Amino acid sequence: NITLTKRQQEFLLLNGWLQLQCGHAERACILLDALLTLNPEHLAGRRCRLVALLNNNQGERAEKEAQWLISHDPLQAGNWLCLSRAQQLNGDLDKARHAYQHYLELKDH
Amino acid sequence: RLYPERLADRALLDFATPHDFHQAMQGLRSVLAEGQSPELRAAAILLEQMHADEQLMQMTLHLLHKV
Ligand SMILES: [Cl-]
């Protein structure tokens, strides 16, 4: 049994974001996968890994992770923007356009 | 322009932005070193590979006003 403390979860999250912000998308996914294995309910890590998967050209994993956030947090408009990009990387431009519309609608509330 | 796609990339990276470094890194490596799953074993090897970059990582995070 393995656990991370609250400060350790944030330290692992900031390092995952650092690699993303600094253009190391795969390192971000590697670090944030470990974070979300030990705390799969960490939303900030879910969002960071999602955009990390997009920049790592992993549209398949990104689509499922965009769906996960749409399910467990449907109010956040940024979830549909991520689904739009993932479905775009997956070639389904029709779906990507529909997910982008819901992103525009949800931004206006 | 009809659609603000020029702001899409900036919006994605804002969406991903979350709201002592040496000691914290050595502590996290300590915990991840015991995980047997592939995810923890992959991240433990990565954090060990970036060990020579701790000062650079702390400096960059400090400039980004995060750590
Ligand atoms: Cl030391």
Author numbering:
A (entry chain A): 2 to 110
B (entry chain B): 45 to 63, 74 to 121
What does the study report here?
SctX proteins are secreted substrates and are essential components of type III secretion systems. The type III secretion substrate SctX binds its chaperone at two distinct sites: (i) its α1 helix interacts with the concave groove of SctY and (ii) the two C-terminal helices α2 and α3 cover the large hydrophobic surface formed by the N-terminal TPR of the chaperone.
We co-purified and crystallized two different complexes of AscX and YscY, with the substrate truncated N-terminally to residue 30 (AscX31) or residue 48 (AscX49). The AscX31–YscY complex crystallized with two almost identical complexes in the asymmetric unit. Despite AscX containing all amino acids after residue 30, the electron density only supported model building from Arg45, indicating that the N-terminus is disordered. Superimposing the YscY monomers using LSQKAB revealed a purely rotational relation between the two chains, with an angle of 90.1° between the twofold axis and the centroid vector and a rotation of χ = 179.0°. Furthermore, AscX31–YscY did not show oligomerization when subjected to gel filtration, where it eluted as a single peak at the retention volume expected for a 1:1 heterodimer. Interestingly, both AscX monomers showed a bend in the α3 helix at Ala106 despite the high propensity of alanine for the formation of helices. An extended C-terminus of AscX would not fit into this configuration of the proteins, hence the α3 kink facilitates the assembly of the disulfide-bridged heterotetramer in the asymmetric unit of the AscX31–YscY crystals. In AscX31–YscY, the distance between the phenylalanine side chain and the terminal methyl group of Met79 amounts to 3.9 Å.
